[PDB]
Design a protein around this motif. Structure first.
Motif, short mmCIF file in Angstrom:
data_model
loop_
_atom_site.label_atom_id
_atom_site.label_comp_id
_atom_site.label_asym_id
_atom_site.label_seq_id
_atom_site.Cartn_x
_atom_site.Cartn_y
_atom_site.Cartn_z
N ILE A 32 -27.08 -2.02 2.42
CA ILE A 32 -27.99 -0.92 2.71
C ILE A 32 -27.27 0.04 3.65
O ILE A 32 -26.91 -0.33 4.77
CB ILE A 32 -29.31 -1.40 3.34
N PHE A 49 -27.46 -7.68 3.91
CA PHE A 49 -28.64 -8.46 4.07
C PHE A 49 -28.85 -9.40 2.90
O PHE A 49 -28.49 -9.09 1.81
CB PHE A 49 -29.83 -7.53 4.12
N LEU A 50 -29.45 -10.55 3.17
CA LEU A 50 -29.77 -11.53 2.16
C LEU A 50 -31.28 -11.51 1.99
O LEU A 50 -31.99 -11.92 2.85
CB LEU A 50 -29.28 -12.90 2.54
N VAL A 51 -31.73 -11.00 0.87
CA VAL A 51 -33.14 -10.85 0.65
C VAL A 51 -33.75 -11.88 -0.26
O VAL A 51 -33.35 -12.02 -1.34
CB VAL A 51 -33.43 -9.47 0.07
N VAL A 55 -39.28 -10.73 -2.69
CA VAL A 55 -39.73 -9.58 -1.91
C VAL A 55 -39.81 -8.34 -2.80
O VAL A 55 -38.86 -8.02 -3.53
CB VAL A 55 -38.80 -9.34 -0.71
N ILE A 64 -37.58 -2.00 6.31
CA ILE A 64 -36.48 -1.18 6.84
C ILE A 64 -37.01 -0.13 7.80
O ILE A 64 -36.40 0.15 8.84
CB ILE A 64 -35.68 -0.56 5.69
N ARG A 67 -37.36 -1.72 11.02
CA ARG A 67 -36.09 -2.04 11.65
C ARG A 67 -35.43 -0.81 12.25
O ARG A 67 -34.68 -0.93 13.22
CB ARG A 67 -35.16 -2.71 10.63
O1 LIG Z 1 -39.65 -11.41 3.68
C1 LIG Z 1 -38.50 -11.92 4.18
O2 LIG Z 1 -38.48 -13.05 4.62
C2 LIG Z 1 -37.28 -11.09 4.22
C3 LIG Z 1 -36.05 -11.61 4.66
C4 LIG Z 1 -34.94 -10.80 4.70
C5 LIG Z 1 -35.03 -9.47 4.31
O3 LIG Z 1 -33.93 -8.70 4.35
C6 LIG Z 1 -33.88 -7.52 5.04
C7 LIG Z 1 -34.38 -7.43 6.34
C8 LIG Z 1 -34.29 -6.23 7.02
C9 LIG Z 1 -33.72 -5.12 6.43
C10 LIG Z 1 -33.20 -5.21 5.14
C11 LIG Z 1 -33.29 -6.41 4.46
C12 LIG Z 1 -36.24 -8.95 3.87
C13 LIG Z 1 -37.36 -9.75 3.83
#
Ligand SMILES: O=C(O)c1ccc(Oc2ccccc2)cc1
Length: 115
Positions: A32, A49-51, A55, A64, A67
């Motif tokens: 990102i 990031f690991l999403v 989600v 975001i 954040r």
């Molecule tokens: O719902 C969750 O648990 C979760 C975990 C990690 C995530 O990644 C992000 C986090 C912040 C900014 C960009 C991606 C997003 C959701």
């Protein structure tokens, strides 16, 4: 501070995604980055990031926003291959299959305008 693809070789980016598939199989590896010409919005603290794959893209937008610590008056758009994500309430797992890079990451860009 340069874009991710200028700091890691293609081979190394592929390797990273493969490692993530092994270590965090249920997560989508995401990069990102702030739009090149962005002037209003701040930089994120990190880029990778690991999403979790369930989600929704529309929830990712709200995450975001938090954040970046934005006020409700600040505009914010999250683009994946130029498509705005604010109304895409589809899980990132499905966007991943469609929009992933050749290196296996899902790249996004955020800006204060949707051009
Ligand atoms: O719902 C969750 O648990 C979760 C975990 C990690 C995530 O990644 C992000 C986090 C912040 C900014 C960009 C991606 C997003 C959701």
């Amino acid at each position: 501070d340069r874009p991710f693809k200028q700091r890691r070789s293609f081979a190394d980016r592929c390797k990273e995604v493969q490692q993530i598939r092994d270590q965090h199989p249920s997560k989508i590896p995401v990069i990102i980055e702030r739009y090149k010409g962005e002037k209003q919005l701040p930089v994120l603290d990190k880029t990778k990031f690991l999403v979790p794959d369930h989600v929704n893209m529309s929830e990712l937008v709200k995450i975001i926003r938090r954040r970046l610590q934005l006020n409700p008056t600040q505009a914010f758009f999250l683009l994946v291959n130029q498509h705005s994500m604010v109304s895409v309430s589809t899980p990132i797992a499905d966007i991943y299959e469609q929009e992933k890079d050749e290196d296996g990451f899902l790249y996004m860009v955020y800006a204060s305008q949707e051009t």
